[PDB]
Amino acid sequence: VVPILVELDGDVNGHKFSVRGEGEGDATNGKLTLKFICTTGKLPVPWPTLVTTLTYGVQCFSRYPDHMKRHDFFKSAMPEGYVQERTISFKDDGTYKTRAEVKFEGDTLVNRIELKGIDFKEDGNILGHKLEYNFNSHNVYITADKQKNGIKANFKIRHNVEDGSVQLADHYQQNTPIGDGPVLLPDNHYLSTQSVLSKDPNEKRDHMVLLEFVTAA
């Protein structure tokens, strides 16, 4: 078991919001349990749009098969951390540009994300908060690039809407290891992520109790 504390900030159409969260991840069992909270009074965009980014921002906890243990890249660069740049193009609802830094500081993992939102318009799903609290499992395809000496991930994420509309957003990610150690970049693989959400009625504050199960293949 490994504890994790992730603090991130994001600016969307002039609205600034910071979110801090804590939890634990079992790599052997391939499980992650997180709980977030926004210090600001209200968060502009729907929570899932950022919850998915926070979930996919860390893949070290994700369990890997025995044959893929040596193939993994995020664990190899874990001792010295890494920096990730993600472009998330929503379908007709603008685009997100995020820069993240992941590092095992002291004896605990730390994850710092900075998010920019652009091309947002009123009456959209993002602006109208029409997205519900449910989520969906997904698949992410990762492939190595020697020219960038890194790993590039790509996939499509389906976000649900109250009226039944489903928005397909394209996620692209590029990694760069902060350290100078061996890369051990995998040629190509796919990771399946299963996410569930729950809320704790003890506190009126929204909890976003988040559970992930990630498996590579």
Add this chain to the structure above:
Amino acid sequence: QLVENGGGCVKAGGSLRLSCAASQGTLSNLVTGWFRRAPGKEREFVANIGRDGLTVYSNSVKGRFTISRDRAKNTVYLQMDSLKPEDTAVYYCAGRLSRFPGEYDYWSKGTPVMVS
């Protein structure tokens, strides 16, 4: 890449001649095989044609399908007879570089098939 075609829904007892070919090159050397995947059941086997010249069929479908490879046309034709509702599964054509039992390296998109 392996390209498969010629599958369409038909009545009970209909005959379908499914055609499979290879874009990389001639598949006369390569061993060819046909597989089926049920919508609600685990994938099963349709048939196989080896490099020696055998035409092996699953016991359940034995005596129904007939595979024939043509080197002049460099194509594998699977003729169907007495088609039954149990063959609703989607058919896939696959190829292998070796004569010996094992998993086929190549694969094809395949086409759906229905009965009744």
Add this chain to the structure above:
Amino acid sequence: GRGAAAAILSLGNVLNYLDRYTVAGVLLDIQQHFGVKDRGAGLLQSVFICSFMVAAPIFGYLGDRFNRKVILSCGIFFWSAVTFSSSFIPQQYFWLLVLSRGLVGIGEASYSTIAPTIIGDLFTKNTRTLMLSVFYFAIPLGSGLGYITGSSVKQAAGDWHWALRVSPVLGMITGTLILILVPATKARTSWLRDMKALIRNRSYVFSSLATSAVSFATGALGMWIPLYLHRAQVVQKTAEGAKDSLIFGAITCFTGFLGVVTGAGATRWCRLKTQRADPLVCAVGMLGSAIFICLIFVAAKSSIVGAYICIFVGETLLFSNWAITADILMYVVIPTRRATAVALQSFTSHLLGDAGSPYLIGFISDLIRQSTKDSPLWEFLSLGYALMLCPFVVVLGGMFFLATALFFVSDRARAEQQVNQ
């Protein structure tokens, strides 16, 4: 690099078979010096092969447990030292020689079980097949070089002891090269169920029995041909033995090469014509081999050149079938059960034949000689009569191959079915 590692491994296998079959060349000197009968001559190879076959599975499990390189080098050094020590054995004590042969069998089983895994792990491209082919090409070369080296050392040094002294020196050397040029490489219930499943396979069992008969015939002939030829020479007015062993070893290696090539070509030609080609070519080749191994006994007394050409043809035919029977085996069995089936077939082949076969021939010869009078002609006739059993075993193996031919297509179709699911 990897190529150098493969070359050193091939040389190590060559020396392994060299020391395996060195004793065959100087069997006559060993029996004369130790004052033992043909039964004692058999004991050596019998216990050696028994220990080899009993020890191979343990070496597979060790290869799983520990790195292959260390085990291979340790076995090299161990059996090299054992062979060197066995050269210096008191004439009074004979059990020490058989114990040393058993230990050398342990080492050779270790080598045969570990080296293939290293060879496979070094390369994962088309060159891996070529390296395995080079290994199997060196095996007959190893046996040949063993015969020739034993004969030459006996002729030159004038004592059979030196035959077991030169080769270990060449052995230990290559051992030091193993760790220099070879980089380090990088369930019971399931096996029991697999074994339970294989026995129900008719073609696989018949092929296993046929290759067991092949092993029986190969071991018996390769062990007793030099002594039989020397006896034939002694019976005749004019007699030589080093030259006879030299010629036999040269013929053995050339026969291995030519038979492998010709069997591959013939099975390739026959497969395109009709199915069940591999078992049929195996059966016909072994029938011809049995015919010539029966004709050798009639030819030897008339002349030794006739016997040598008979050995030529018989070795060619008997060595041409190994690749074909291996292909039949790995056709019949499914990929999830290839390793277990191959190990079981090797164990059965060694147990049924080539282990206790030299002892059986020696016991038969001793019984024939004891029942009748003792003299050079009587010894020659007894050895010939004892060897007359090998053609029967080869014919039985040919019948087994024919029966496998009967159950070939059906078993292959099944295997394919279980592969699909």
Add this chain to the structure above:
Amino acid sequence: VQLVENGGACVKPGGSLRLSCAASGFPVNRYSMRWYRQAPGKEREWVAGMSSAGDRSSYEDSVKGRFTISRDDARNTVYLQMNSLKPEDTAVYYCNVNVGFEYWGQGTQVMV
């Protein structure tokens, strides 16, 4: 919780067929149902959805006004009507509903 699909068969151009998706283990009315369509060797695409409250349904531009999906809580089943048949319907269908952890139905295959 399990989802079962039925009613799928090939249709001649212009024909109308009815698909049915049923659920066992959870109340269908409490949560929204969805329908996906994917072709052989093609990425999955959302083809239809009905809101949890059932006030309105969401469809894409290509097929707006054809599926006309309806839902019955007493029958615990959602019905789909082909209406006009187009080549895009050749792709196979899937019935999806996520209660807690997501659940994917077995669906049925239909081709023109």
